[PDB]
Design a protein around this ligand. Structure first.
Ligand SMILES: [Mg+2]
Ligand SMILES: [Mg+2]
Ligand SMILES: [Mg+2]
Ligand SMILES: [Mg+2]
Ligand SMILES: [Mg+2]
Ligand SMILES: [Mg+2]
Ligand SMILES: [Mg+2]
Lengths: 241, 204, 226, 249, 231, 195, 244, 243, 196
């Protein structure tokens, strides 16, 4: 049973250590979701600060990888920050060597290749994280690319990750079946954020205060996260209609 | 002391009508001293011919190296290397020694076995390819060869006329160079016969 | 060598003469000095010819792999950055002086790069021994908002100034036009103003003129069956 | 420091290399892919089995250009395939194009990929690749060809074949229909017919990935003016081009 | 048990068994005592012979003019660690013209031992050490365990039956700490403390090893006839 | 060191090598043997920089003796000379090149032919009816060019060699203290003990 | 740490055997049979491909017989991918030797090198051995025509006739029965095919399941020719020796 | 099973048992705490007096990094020293390239990445310490706590070791009773009390209190040990509250 | 080359000529010597063009990675990174760099890193071959806390004179203004500044 401890094949052609790394990915009990506007890419994630001794401003699973790229992580924070540091190093190096900003999809591929290596080389363990990369790419426009512990990645019209990803996913699928377009047809990112929060509320059947969420927004030439007060203003607009 | 003129020698190649020719002198010396009159500078790997002038130790080393590489090429590709392909290989191989080069002036001649097209090329010691439609020259009498070829050459010579043209270009170039001569060989190459001729020339 | 690059309305044009020399001797009368880094990024090189070819091929190879990796068309700034960092590391020992022009999804571009690794930006550039002759023409006739036809005209006039006035340059003009939203068009021997006049005499020999000691057939065939 | 400097694939008492057998089992589970060689071309094809409908599956390319005249498809572990494609593209340059100034012939690029796969089967501290590849290509002196490469590093040339899930059925289907006079359009038609059998759901241009090695495409070169450069022989068919041939089915 | 095959494995209760087993080798070692006043610091060590034909194994090692130690456990490990201390004392003198503080020596030993407890292929050191010295802040005594724990003390003992000596020193604390300017009295309290750990045998002239360092006293080791005075 | 000559006649190869060893101002020795037997039918003479000559020669000898034992077989003179050439060609691009020139005289037992190879310190190899290194050729080649015949006997080879050495002793400024002469033929290697 | 997962590929059993070598030999015993036969005027190599298919491109396929240089070929039994690693190494050693001495490598010197490489994997490095046995057919001007085999232990031996792969016990008995010293290449060709015919686990022996080669001084005058038979030529020699 | 025999192995429920066992060594250690005040941080630790023979004040546990950061830990003391040695190298290399002393959040991640690295391989063992650390930088005071998994967050107050539950509840009261904040001087007094309270779970032996602080107003943003009179006054204030 | 940077009330301004020469030939008459390493941290380069471009590209990379991890770097931090490269590779570089930047805490700052890789924080700095000719002029005319218009005038008049006397300086005068309000680029042509 040592084929269970390291990344070698089981007799059914499976990699158990990879499968168990996916299981670690839900250990924070956080759900996240990402959607695309006409001009922007929005990512939201639940925020849970279960201890009163915590400084809540330091509790985050959203990362500013470069000026243009944001990353939300589903998984434990040590592995999340390992991935974040590496992604930051890769994006900076890419710009130095090739003279232009690393695209969201190329960074996702690169991080996915690194992950593939951990599934083939025995001395390295997979990271127990799923990485959702967002930007407004200069060639491809609003972009969502997500990586997992198998070294798989793909681009998304929209996506969700966490213990309740299925509910959010089906909710999002239902909306896009209706609208028949690959994105939220909204001018302003404020409204795309409101859409994103609204559909998370429907899908999880729970309400949010301003401290229950984390929001990241990508626009042309920048990614930024919202303060509790920008989020409050979002929540207020949702309630008043 | 200049490594490319210690041993002396020349090579010239020309294209004609459905043929190519490549020729060389036979001298090897140590500066003023004539050492050998049987030092041939043209080699072949299948149907591709390579002439090399310059430092004689490097001439021999490079022949052995290209025999080595074309033998492996053949075992793996299951066909003989072509002139165009071999030309790239010579260039690659020379440039890999960019900062400690072989002191040589190689010349490739042959006919592509598929297209039937005559091919020649020359290189500087560091792999820069000169691919000439007409003729290529190399060695300690290269100025003299440029002079001979530029006036004697005309396109589309029949193999037997090309032989006279290239022979006369070599012979008279060599006789104006102290470090070239002591015999000469001319290869006339067609798609499926190659004839080799040793010329009679002055032995001083 | 004379090489120039000229920006115009919707693109960029590069041009070069076709003489390569070894000291005062013309080694090749119809050299090709316009190199392809990628389909729409071309460069022209002066200095050590092996180096301009080699550095162009190497970065071209790595640019192609980069392109496949990123599923994007290559950018001129990438070729530029990779070239300059390679050259800088070799401290001028790789004797490549290049004009790099191209179009990519980002627009149209024109840069020069010097063997030690410095680069520059401009609307018109010249390099090589003929560059002062070329630059005199460019400084006299360049203007903003050139058309394609005007830029081709200017670029080849600038090469001609090198051809006629610089002993290091001669023979023909090669041009390559890179226009936004189009295939790059390579115009080999765009101008041919130096064809040799017919000689006074034919120097074809009577057969049997040359003295021969020996003949033999050379076996170019592999070891035979049976 | 990687302290696994010993083989993770070894011979069992019965002579089996377990990890290779298990890699082959992972390939067996994989989505079906196939290739067919015609007189004037080769076709490779597979199903784009999208993981969710929110996934944009045109951003996941199962059929890959390796050189302008060589393409590849796989069955098995997608991520293993993706890294092999990166290495294969590179080795085509480093161990061939930077030496001979031309792209490698199909059989030698296959040889290089195969060697990489063999080494993952013997080198210290790694597992074999969990993929089988089908590699289609053209070169001047060997013409059109099609190869399969397995997790062991073994490769074989085929007239037509299939790998993954429905391969036993697909191979029997292909043996009936293959002859040495097929024209590329015939082989495409047969590929589409064969592939329909192993596909459950949707079967259209958006769920099928199909590429050919055929004629040179000067329109895909990106530049004009060099007579000898005539364009890549590899071409991926569009969604629309597949659907046009699905009415003719 | 399933967790004691190497030093890189915690047990389910958070223990490191290879380290605990290393600690066990000290317990089998012959007793050695250390104690100090405000002017001097003393080591006393009961040396062990193999049989009547054999020498008594030395227990005390000089590290510098102002510093030295005694060992209990694997003697070759004491040699490795004392050699390291000599080098570090030496480095401090040569580079900074400064005598290495005893406290700093303790920190360096801790860190050297720690590395052998956290990596594959290593083993912990199987020796305990008592380090005495006199530096710019006076007399010092340190106890080192191969877990890497180093502790500053007025007095202590390690090795087989060290518990007797240790209890004695605990009662005497208020007396021996005041033995300033009288080297011989401090040594007596040391020989008395170590006597609380003998059984079957007693302190003989080839049995007993004493070292002392202090105010105007280079670290010096007494063996043989030079300890008869205290027997 | 200074003079080394070789001549290949009908059935043997003869190597003649000077005896002097000169450390600047004094002739330290007048009986030095500038040669090593590489195999029973292959002899190598050498000249060039002090120390490097003998070091190179003994290194080559050790290698050929190793090959002979490993394969229970004597390499042909051509094969030995190719091995030696490669070593010098590799050495010339070394940190400190061997400054050593050699003649290899061997009798090929398979072809029943004597063979003489001349190789300089650059790895420049040539097969010759007669050869030399240094200035020796400048004084002797006009004589060899005149009298040499490919069908000469061993004794005629020695007489032509005597004439070469006499011309060297006449016109050469340095006193090289005569030569040691060795013959390589089908029966192996022997030293002519009065010359 | 990592020790836990180490198979220890290079240890003796208590009987003084090498486990991995023994198990590699077991693997090799399921490979298609290969046969070499040495005559006075040349050598024959004959080998059976492992169960084909009608869609396999035979004329571009090689799985058993490989050229090492113009004078030396091998027949492979075992893991094909492993074999190609070793084959490419041997091709390089041959060229290294030719470059160094300007003479073609003698057959045994090549065989010994490849065998030493295999031996190394059984003694150091902790890697699995190569799952390959070779038959070497070649010519040099010292010993003339020669046959050798090597196996995963790196042991090699010389033979007048030999088999490797499946059913070598049966094959070897049959070769030993009919082999004679004064036998000629055309006789050896027939013996090789007759032997494969009888030992095959297939229903019949057809051209599409064979690879075939001869090394003959049937190259004009003192020189040697290798001939890797095309599918049609294997078909003809099956008819001519009356097996089909 | 056997999933808990080797570091970096995921169990079937996605856990790294060797890290969880490291936490047991931490829970077994003495109590250590930190309190973030108005313009600084305070650190305090319980030091068990195993014997009379321990020289009082002399086995110092709190460690400075650079000049502005304090670190305290519970668990295996040598592991904590190893982590601080690494932290000192990271701080030095940051200051060398960037000039400015390392900011506290930047320093937190340096320790976090290093501790996390020791959960990636089976050739190393996780750290058997939880570390409370922080100080003052250009954006104010920062307090952090870092676990054997590499996990860390910023805190208002923090505690670890055997008396962690007791300390936490005490720390929570302070957070509730002072939304505006605590002065550095108040924080020292409170820290002394909380260690005295938490020492119940360790009552067998007596202990020695050790406190340190960095405060913009009280120490000029440098890390200093609380000594002499100010220490005594905090010991007294603590004695009172446990009486 | 003539380059300078000047702190003033609202921040800092950088100025440069646009001439780069190979001997007496003007290889480029419209060079941009004002190079951006971060949004509001710029530098002017003098010495080897290859070296200063290599250095600036590396610094830009470093500050991009610094920003990703730790937020906006100070001007001092940028100067320190420059200095580290110039000092440690002093044997193989010919680079004289002025670093200028705007913080909201620190406002406008100027650091000069001369040939040996020392660093010097200054109210203003001048460098390049042209600067020799304006040491007297700049020292007489610089005041602290000038307005934006005054600082533009000071730089324009200063570089005017450097260009007048230095054959290696010329072309256009380029400037970059760094304040709370943003980043403003200015350019002045010969027909303006030659008449001053
Ligand atoms: Mg792994
Ligand atoms: Mg001549
Ligand atoms: Mg003459
Ligand atoms: Mg001559
Ligand atoms: Mg430089
Ligand atoms: Mg020579
Ligand atoms: Mg001026």
């Amino acid at each position: 049973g040592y084929d269970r401890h390291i990344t070698i094949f089981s007799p059914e052609g499976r990699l158990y250590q990879v499968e168990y790394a996916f299981k670690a990915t839900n250990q924070t009990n956080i759900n996240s979701l990402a959607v695309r506007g006409k001009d922007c890419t929005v990512v939201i994630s639940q925020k849970k600060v279960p201890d009163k001794l915590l400084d809540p401003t330091t509790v985050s699973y959203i990362f500013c990888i470069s000026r243009t790229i944001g990353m939300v992580v589903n998984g434990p924070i040590p592995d999340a920050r390992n991935a974040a540091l590496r992604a930051k190093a890769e994006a900076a190096e890419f710009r130095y060597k090739y003279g232009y900003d690393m695209p969201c999809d190329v960074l996702a591929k690169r991080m996915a290749n690194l992950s593939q290596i951990y599934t083939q080389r025995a001395y390295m363990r997979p990271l127990g994280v799923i990485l959702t990369f967002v930007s407004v790419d200069e060639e491809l426009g609003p972009s969502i690319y997500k990586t997992d512990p198998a070294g798989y990645y793909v681009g998304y019209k929209a996506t969700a990750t966490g213990p309740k990803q299925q509910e959010i996913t089906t909710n999002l699928e239902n909306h896009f079946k209706k609208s028949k377009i690959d994105h939220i047809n909204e001018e302003s990112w404020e409204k795309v954020v409101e859409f994103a929060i609204t559909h998370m509320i429907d899908a999880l059947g729970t309400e949010f205060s301003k401290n229950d969420l984390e929001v990241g927004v990508a626009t042309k030439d920048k990614f930024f996260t919202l303060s509790a007060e920008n989020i409050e203003e979002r929540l207020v607009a949702i309630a008043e209609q | 002391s200049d490594p490319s003129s210690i041993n002396g020698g020349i090579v010239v190649a020309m294209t004609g009508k459905d043929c190519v020719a490549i020729a060389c002198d036979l001298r090897l010396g140590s500066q003023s001293l004539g050492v050998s009159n049987k030092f041939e500078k043209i080699f072949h790997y299948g149907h591709v011919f390579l002439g090399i002038t310059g430092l004689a130790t490097d001439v021999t080393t490079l022949n052995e190296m290209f025999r080595y590489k074309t033998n492996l090429y053949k075992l793996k590709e299951e066909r003989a290397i072509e002139p165009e392909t071999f030309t790239q290989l010579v260039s690659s191989s020379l440039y890999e020694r960019r900062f400690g080069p072989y002191f040589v002036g190689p010349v490739v001649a042959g006919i592509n076995s598929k297209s039937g097209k005559p091919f020649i090329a020359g290189f500087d010691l560091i792999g820069c390819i000169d691919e000439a439609k007409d003729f290529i020259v190399s060695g300690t009498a290269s100025d003299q060869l440029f002079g001979m070829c530029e006036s004697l050459y005309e396109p589309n010579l029949e193999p037997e006329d090309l032989f006279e043209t290239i022979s006369q270009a070599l012979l008279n170039a060599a006789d104006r160079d102290a470090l070239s001569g002591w015999g000469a060989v001319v290869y006339i190459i067609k798609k499926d016969e190659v004839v080799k001729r040793y010329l009679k020339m002055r032995q001083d | 060598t004379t090489i120039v690059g000229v920006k115009f309305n919707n693109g960029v044009v590069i041009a070069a003469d076709t003489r390569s020399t070894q000291g005062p001797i013309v080694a090749d009368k119809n050299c090709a000095k316009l190199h392809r880094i990628s389909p729409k990024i071309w460069c022209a090189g002066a200095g050590t010819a092996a180096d301009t070819e080699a550095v162009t091929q190497l970065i071209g190879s790595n640019i192609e792999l980069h392109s496949l990796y990123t599923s994007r068309e290559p950018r001129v700034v990438s070729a530029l950055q990779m070239l300059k960092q390679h050259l800088f590391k070799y401290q001028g020992h790789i004797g490549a002086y290049l004009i790099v022009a191209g179009v990519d999804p980002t627009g149209s571009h024109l840069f020069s790069i010097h063997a030690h690794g410095s680069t520059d930006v401009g609307y018109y550039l010249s390099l090589g021994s003929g560059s002062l002759a070329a630059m005199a023409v460019l400084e006299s006739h360049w203007k903003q908002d050139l058309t394609k036809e005007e830029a081709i005209k200017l670029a080849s006039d600038a090469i001609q100034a090198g051809i006629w006035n610089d002993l290091g340059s001669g023979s023909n003009v090669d041009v390559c036009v890179m226009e936004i939203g189009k295939d790059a068009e390579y115009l080999r021997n765009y101008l041919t103003p130096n064809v040799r006049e017919e000689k006074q005499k034919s120097y074809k020999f009577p057969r049997g003129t040359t003295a021969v000691l020996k003949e033999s057939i050379v076996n170019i065939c592999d070891i035979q069956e049976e | 420091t990687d302290r696994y400097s010993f083989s993770l694939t070894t011979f069992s008492p019965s002579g089996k290399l377990g990890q290779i057998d298990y890699a082959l089992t992972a390939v067996k589970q994989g989505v079906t892919s196939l290739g067919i060689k015609a007189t004037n071309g080769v076709v490779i094809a597979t199903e784009k089995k999208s993981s969710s409908p929110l996934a944009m599956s045109e951003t996941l390319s199962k059929v890959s250009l390796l050189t302008p005249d060589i393409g590849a498809v796989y069955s098995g572990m997608g991520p293993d395939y993706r890294v092999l494609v990166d290495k294969s593209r590179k080795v085509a340059h480093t161990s061939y194009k930077r030496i001979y100034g031309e792209y490698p012939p199909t059989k030698l690029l296959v040889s290089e990929v195969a060697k990489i796969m063999q080494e993952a089967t013997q080198s210290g501290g790694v597992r074999p690749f969990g993929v089988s590849l089908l590699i289609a290509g053209h070169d001047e002196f060997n013409g059109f060809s099609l190869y399969q490469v397995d997790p062991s590093g073994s490769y074989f040339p085929w007239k037509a074949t299939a790998i993954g899930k429905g391969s036993v059925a697909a191979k029997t289907f292909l043996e009936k229909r293959w002859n040495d006079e097929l024209e590329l359009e015939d082989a495409i038609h047969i590929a589409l017919l064969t592939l329909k059998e192993s596909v459950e759901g949707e079967f259209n241009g958006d769920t099928i990935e199909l590429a050919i090695i055929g004629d040179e495409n000067p329109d895909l070169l990106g530049y004009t003016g060099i007579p000898t450069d005539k364009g890549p022989r590899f071409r991926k068919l569009t969604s629309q081009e597949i659907n046009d041939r699905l009415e003719a089915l | 048990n399933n967790y004691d095959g190497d030093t890189v494995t915690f047990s389910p209760t958070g223990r490191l068994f290879q380290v605990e087993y290393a600690l066990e080798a000290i317990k089998q070692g012959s007793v050695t005592v250390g104690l100090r006043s405000n002017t001097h610091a003393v080591l006393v060590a009961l040396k062990r012979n193999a049989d009547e034909l054999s020498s008594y194994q030395k227990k005390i090692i000089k590290c510098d003019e102002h510093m030295g130690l005694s060992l209990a456990g694997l003697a070759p490990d004491a040699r490795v660690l004392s050699n390291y201390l000599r080098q570090q004392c030496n480095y401090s003198s040569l580079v900074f013209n400064r005598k290495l503080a005893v406290e700093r020596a303790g920190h360096l030993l801790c860190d050297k031992a720690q590395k052998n407890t956290q990596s594959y292929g290593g083993r912990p050191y199987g020796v305990g050490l008592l380090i005495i010295g006199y530096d710019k802040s006076g007399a010092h005594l340190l106890e080192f365990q191969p877990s890497g724990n180093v502790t500053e003390l007025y007095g202590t003992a390690i090795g087989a039956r060290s518990q007797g000596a240790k209890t004695y020193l605990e009662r005497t604390l208020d007396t021996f700490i005041k033995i300033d300017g009288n080297p011989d009295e401090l040594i007596k309290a040391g020989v008395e403390a170590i006597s609380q750990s003998l059984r079957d045998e007693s302190l003989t002239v080839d049995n007993l090893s004493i070292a002392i360092v202090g105010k105007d006293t280079p670290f010096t080791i007494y063996d043989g006839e030079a300890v008869a005075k205290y027997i | 060191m200074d003079i080394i000559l070789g001549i290949r006649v009908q059935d043997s190869v003869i190597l003649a090598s000077s005896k002097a060893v000169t450390r600047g101002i004094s002739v330290l020795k007048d009986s030095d043997d500038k040669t090593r037997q590489l195999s029973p039918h292959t002899l190598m003479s050498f000249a060039g920089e002090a120390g490097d000559t003998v070091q190179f020669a003994e290194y080559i000898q050790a290698n050929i003796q190793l090959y002979s034992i490993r394969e229970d077989y004597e390499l042909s003179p051509q094969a030995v000379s190719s091995f030696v050439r490669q070593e010098l060609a590799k050495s010339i691009r070394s940190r400190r090149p061997y400054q050593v020139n050699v003649l290899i005289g061997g009798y090929d037992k398979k072809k029943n032919k004597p063979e003489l190879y001349q190789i300089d310190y650059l790895g420049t190899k040539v097969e010759l009816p007669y050869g030399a290194h240094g200035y020796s050729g400048f004084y002797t080649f006009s004589l060899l060019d005149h009298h040499y015949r490919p069908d000469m006997t061993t004794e005629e080879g020695l007489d032509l060699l005597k004439l070469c050495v006499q011309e060297l002793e006449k016109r050469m400024p340095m006193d090289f203290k005569g030569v040691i002469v060795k013959i390589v033929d089908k029966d192996g290697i022997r030293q002519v003990d009065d010359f | 740490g990592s020790r836990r997962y180490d198979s220890r590929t290079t240890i003796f059993s208590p009987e003084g055997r090498l486990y991995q070598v023994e198990y590699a030999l077991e693997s090799i015993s399921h490979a298609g049979t290969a046969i070499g036969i040495m005559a006075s005027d040349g050598i024959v190599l004959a080998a059976e491909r492992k169960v084909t298919s009608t869609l396999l491109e035979q004329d571009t396929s090689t799985e058993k017989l490989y050229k090492l240089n113009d004078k030396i070929a091998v027949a492979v039994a075992g893991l094909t991918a492993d074999a190609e690693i070793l084959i490419n190494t041997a091709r390089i050693h041959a060229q290294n030797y030719l470059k160094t001495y300007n003479e073609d490598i003698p057959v045994e010197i090549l065989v010994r090198r490849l065998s030493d490489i295999k031996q190394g994997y059984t003694q150091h490095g902790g890697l699995r051995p190569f799952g390959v046995s070779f038959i070497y057919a070649g010519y040099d001007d010292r010993y003339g025509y020669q046959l050798y085999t090597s196996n995963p232990s790196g042991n090699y031996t010389g033979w007048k006739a030999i088999s490797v792969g499946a059913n070598t016990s049966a094959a070897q008995t049959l070769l030993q029965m009919d082999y004679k010293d004064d036998m000629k290449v055309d006789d050896a060709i027939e013996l090789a095919l007759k032997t494969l015919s009888k030992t095959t686990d297939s229903s019949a022996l057809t051209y599409d399941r064979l690879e075939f080669a001869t090394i003959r001084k049937g190259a004009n005058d003192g020189e040697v020719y290798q001939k890797i038979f095309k599918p049609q030529e294997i078909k003809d020699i099956l008819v001519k020796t009356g097996i089909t | 099973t056997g999933y808990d025999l080797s570091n970096s192995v995921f169990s079937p429920d996605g856990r790294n048992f060797q890290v969880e066992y490291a936490v047991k060594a931490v829970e077994n250690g003495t109590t250590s705490i930190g309190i973030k005040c108005n313009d600084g941080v305070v650190f305090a630790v319980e030091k068990l007096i195993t014997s009379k023979l321990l020289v009082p004040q002399k086995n110092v546990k709190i460690q400075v990094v650079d000049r502005h950061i304090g670190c305290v830990y519970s668990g295996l003391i040598p592991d904590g020293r190893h982590l601080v040695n690494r932290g000192r190298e990271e701080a030095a290399s940051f200051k060398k390239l960037y000039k400015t002393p390392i900011p506290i959040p930047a320093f937190a991640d340096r320790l976090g990445q290093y501790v996390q690295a020791h959960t990636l391989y089976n050739s190393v063992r996780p750290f058997g310490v939880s570390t409370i650390f922080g100080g003052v930088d250009k954006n104010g005071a920062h307090l952090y706590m870092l676990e054997p998994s590499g996990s860390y967050w910023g805190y208002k107050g923090a505690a670890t070791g055997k008396g962690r539950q007791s300390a936490k509840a005490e720390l929570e009261k302070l957070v509730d009773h002072h939304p505006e904040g605590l002065s550095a001087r108040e924080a020292v007094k409170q820290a002394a009390k909380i260690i005295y309270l938490a020492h119940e779970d360790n009552k067998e032996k007596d202990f020695e209190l050790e406190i340190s602080w960095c405060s913009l107003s009280e120490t000029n943003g440098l890390h200093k040990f609380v000594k002499g009179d100010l220490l005594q006054e905090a010991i007294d204030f603590a004695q009172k509250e446990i009486n | 080359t003539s380059i300078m940077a000047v702190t003033f009330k609202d921040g800092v301004i950088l100025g440069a000529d646009s001439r780069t020469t190979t001997g007496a030939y003007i290889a480029n008459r419209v060079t941009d010597k004002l190079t951006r390493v971060h949004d509001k941290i710029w530098c002017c380069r003098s010495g080897s063009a290859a070296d200063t471009q290599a250095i600036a590209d590396i610094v830009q990379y470093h500050l991009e990675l610094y920003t990703s991890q730790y937020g906006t770097p100070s001007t001092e931090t940028a100067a320190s990174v420059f200095k580290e490269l110039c000092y440690e590779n002093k044997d193989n570089l010919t680079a004289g760099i002025i670093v200028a930047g705007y913080d909201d805490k620190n406002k406008g700052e100027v650091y000069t890193i001369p040939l040996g890789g020392s660093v010097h924080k200054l109210p203003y700095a001048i460098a390049g071959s042209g600067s020799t000719f304006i040491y007297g002029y700049c020292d007489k005319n610089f005041r602290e806390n000038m307005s934006k218009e005054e600082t533009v005038d000071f730089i324009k008049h200063s570089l005017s004179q450097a260009i007048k006397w230095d054959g290696s300086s010329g072309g256009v005068i380029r400037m970059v203004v760094l304040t709370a309000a943003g980043v403003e680029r200015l350019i002045f042509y010969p027909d303006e500044y030659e008449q001053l």
